[PDB]
Amino acid sequence: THCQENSETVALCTPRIVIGNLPDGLAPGPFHELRTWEIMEHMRLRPPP
Amino acid sequence: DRQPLNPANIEARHHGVSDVPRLGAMDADEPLFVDDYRATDDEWTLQKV
Amino acid sequence: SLQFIGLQRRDVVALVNFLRHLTQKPDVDLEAHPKILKKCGEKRLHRRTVLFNELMLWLGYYRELRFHNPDLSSVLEEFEVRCVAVARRGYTYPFGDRGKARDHLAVLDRTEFDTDVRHDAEIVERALVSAVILAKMSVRETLVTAIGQTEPIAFVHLKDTEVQRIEENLEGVRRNMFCVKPLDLNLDRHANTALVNAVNKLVYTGRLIMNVRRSWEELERKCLARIQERCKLLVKELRMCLSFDSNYCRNILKHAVENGDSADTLLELLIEDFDIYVDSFPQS
Amino acid sequence: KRDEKHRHVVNVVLELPTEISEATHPVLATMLSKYTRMSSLFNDKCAFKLDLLRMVAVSRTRR
């Protein structure tokens, strides 16, 4: 991002600590639901209790 | 009655304050009697819904 | 007329005399005049009575401070004609970057009024910022360029004695906003461009308008908020003792006072049938 | 007379019966002072009657 600091414009860089922080256009909610079922199927939780 | 209502043409109610003139002006046209509460936007949309 | 409970007649008429003295006196507010607050008498009478008396005092104070609030149209027309003259002078002035100069000149051109006090303050502030930026471009002294840090309001290129006099008179306007003295006028044309003199006169008139309007806004805010607080606490005290007179008093007090017409309506409602709810109040 | 106006109100206007009056009713006693000051509106009896109804309502309310 670009940010304002004392009347001047500075650029900001900071890491996305987690995968969900990615934009929805590049990481939509339905894709995360499908990946969550992926993790569930790995852990034999495909039908949850 | 025939004209847009100006603020002076609108009257506020006095519930339980013995409004003899208001009870005499019940079915007249010109003055409009209202409660002092004004509907908010969310309540407005819910009423319309 | 104002009538309240459990107080000697001489001090009531003295308080009325004080309110009649109002517009002639400096720093006019109950905040700056504790003598009127202490006249309500902490440790003079019971609680509900002192709250009622304070509410009545504040409500009459709001009534008259609304009544005396000036219609600034007389000096506002002077502001408008100064705007016209400033726009003409900037029209003839030979700026280098004529585009933005013409844009701000048109913004000054549009500034005519719409007889709403808050719209009054907004448009006079807009006229002031456009006049200041045009003046700064004319003298070519630097000007703001950053986002969200828009042009300030300042008397450009004037001497120190003039700005000191202006600041003193501006604080005087703040303290007593009812009577206004637009007499800080000694701009001379043997120094600085005539555009700078015109815009400085415009800035003076606009600062006068802004300061007086915002002072009245502060007074109205504090008066209505304290009215609300005193009314709510009085209702809280009255809720303890159910009775016909108590219920009537709570009903008349229940009105949400956040508008001037509401305050006047509550004043008339309280005054008209004072004989009814006075039964519930003990005189100490 | 004051009694003349009070009787005029409580019979012609309020249409109250004989068994109820300001002597026994404390709520009617205070309101009768206000109603006499309403010189006009005596032709609208029902408004006064309804007003008395809501006044005796607010007299006994618990909230």
Side-chain angles (χ1 to χ4, degrees), chain A, chain B, chain C residues 1-83 85-284, chain D:
Chain A
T1 196
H2 277 250
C3 171
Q4 218 77 19
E5 278 279 34
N6 45 261
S7 80
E8 270 294 357
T9 47
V10 296
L12 258 64
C13 181
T14 175
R16 289 165 169 156
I17 329 293
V18 295
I19 188 69
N21 282 334
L22 269 86
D24 178 273
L26 307 193
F31 162 70
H32 281 288
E33 293 229 38
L34 185 68
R35 182 172 160 277
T36 301
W37 263 288
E38 254 283 1
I39 297 162
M40 289 164 73
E41 182 102 67
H42 183 187
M43 302 303 159
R44 317 200 80 200
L45 288 164
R46 178 59 134 126
Chain B
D1 44 52
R2 275 171 283 104
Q3 292 283 103
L5 281 167
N6 295 330
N9 215 353
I10 299 183
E11 287 271 328
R13 288 176 182 149
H14 314 306
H15 292 294
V17 196
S18 191
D19 299 338
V20 180
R22 194 244 294 185
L23 297 166
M26 281 277 219
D27 83 338
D29 299 347
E30 275 72 17
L32 193 76
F33 296 104
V34 310
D35 280 34
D36 49 331
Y37 174 75
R38 300 306 203 284
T40 55
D41 308 66
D42 42 6
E43 299 174 0
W44 205 234
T45 63
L46 293 175
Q47 275 188 282
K48 294 154 68 185
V49 154
Chain C
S1 54
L2 301 195
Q3 193 161 36
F4 35 90
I5 312 173
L7 202 163
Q8 288 188 309
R9 272 287 194 113
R10 204 179 73 95
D11 304 351
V12 178
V13 70
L15 189 143
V16 168
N17 250 352
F18 158 67
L19 278 305
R20 297 182 87 159
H21 283 302
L22 182 132
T23 181
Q24 279 68 33
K25 302 298 179 172
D27 201 342
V28 47
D29 190 33
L30 261 66
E31 180 96 343
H33 295 2
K35 71 172 198 165
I36 298 301
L37 171 143
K38 78 198 183 190
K39 258 284 161 56
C40 293
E42 177 167 52
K43 197 65 69 169
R44 283 304 308 269
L45 70 180
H46 197 36
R47 310 293 77 234
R48 55 174 63 152
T49 51
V50 79
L51 277 93
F52 175 92
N53 290 6
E54 201 156 86
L55 180 137
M56 188 82 268
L57 154 71
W58 272 96
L59 207 69
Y61 173 41
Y62 181 82
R63 190 182 80 178
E64 59 191 81
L65 79 85
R66 175 194 53 51
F67 177 52
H68 286 153
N69 172 245
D71 177 21
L72 302 174
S73 59
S74 185
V75 295
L76 173 151
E77 182 157 43
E78 177 64 21
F79 182 86
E80 278 192 339
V81 306
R82 291 177 189 210
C83 282
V86 164
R88 159 194 68 158
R89 188 67 55 52
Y91 164 105
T92 206
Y93 189 96
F95 295 96
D97 53 344
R98 80 284 185 268
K100 80 184 293 179
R102 276 297 206 149
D103 294 332
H104 291 89
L105 205 78
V107 174
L108 289 182
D109 273 346
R110 300 325 295 131
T111 194
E112 277 90 306
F113 288 73
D114 60 350
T115 188
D116 259 324
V117 170
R118 300 84 197 171
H119 302 347
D120 224 311
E122 186 202 311
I123 63 193
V124 65
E125 175 179 12
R126 287 157 54 179
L128 291 204
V129 292
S130 302
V132 173
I133 187 176
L134 272 151
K136 286 291 203 68
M137 289 199 305
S138 75
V139 62
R140 218 168 71 193
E141 167 64 334
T142 201
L143 74 185
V144 308
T145 53
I147 278 175
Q149 208 193 351
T150 88
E151 302 288 342
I153 301 314
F155 287 98
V156 47
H157 218 180
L158 291 194
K159 299 294 192 72
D160 210 358
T161 173
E162 200 78 291
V163 300
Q164 206 66 59
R165 173 194 181 196
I166 289 270
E167 289 157 23
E168 176 96 37
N169 252 325
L170 258 55
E171 294 171 28
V173 171
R174 178 188 173 192
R175 284 191 297 161
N176 183 13
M177 39 144 285
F178 289 106
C179 294
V180 193
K181 281 80 61 180
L183 61 83
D184 304 283
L185 308 175
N186 249 316
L187 270 61
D188 40 359
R189 302 186 297 287
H190 76 296
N192 78 56
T193 174
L195 184 143
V196 158
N197 271 351
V199 301
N200 274 296
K201 283 202 298 186
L202 183 65
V203 165
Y204 175 60
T205 307
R207 289 290 300 276
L208 173 151
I209 292 291
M210 290 248 281
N211 201 305
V212 70
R213 289 306 203 201
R214 302 279 179 205
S215 303
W216 196 55
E217 291 300 313
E218 262 273 2
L219 262 62
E220 195 261 12
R221 289 298 186 293
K222 74 202 310 197
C223 198
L224 290 177
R226 286 166 186 194
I227 275 295
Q228 290 156 27
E229 284 208 51
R230 277 92 160 100
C231 186
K232 291 312 303 182
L233 274 41
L234 178 56
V235 164
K236 280 270 291 176
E237 214 284 324
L238 190 72
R239 206 173 67 113
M240 311 296 291
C241 184
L242 274 51
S243 285
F244 165 78
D245 313 278
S246 307
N247 292 353
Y248 202 114
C249 187
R250 205 185 318 116
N251 281 236
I252 68 190
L253 285 166
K254 251 282 289 180
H255 295 50
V257 182
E258 91 291 11
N259 182 325
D261 286 352
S262 76
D264 288 346
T265 301
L266 194 138
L267 195 143
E268 185 144 25
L269 203 68
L270 267 281
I271 292 308
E272 202 204 65
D273 55 21
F274 169 67
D275 45 297
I276 301 185
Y277 60 81
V278 72
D279 190 300
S280 73
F281 292 82
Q283 305 195 351
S284 188
Chain D
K1 290 184 174 74
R2 278 197 299 272
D3 282 343
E4 184 270 346
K5 293 280 269 285
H6 277 204
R7 291 182 179 278
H8 190 107
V9 170
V10 310
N11 323 308
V12 189
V13 176
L14 289 173
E15 297 261 23
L16 286 158
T18 77
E19 302 184 356
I20 187 72
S21 206
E22 75 283 341
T24 166
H25 203 184
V27 184
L28 202 67
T30 167
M31 301 313 299
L32 259 195
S33 68
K34 203 181 202 298
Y35 297 148
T36 55
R37 298 191 281 147
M38 315 293 290
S39 81
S40 175
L41 312 177
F42 285 140
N43 300 346
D44 197 338
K45 307 175 296 176
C46 312
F48 282 74
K49 270 196 282 178
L50 176 58
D51 193 45
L52 173 61
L53 266 286
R54 29 180 274 148
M55 288 317 299
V56 75
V58 73
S59 83
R60 253 64 168 145
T61 198
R62 312 300 295 181
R63 293 174 166 71

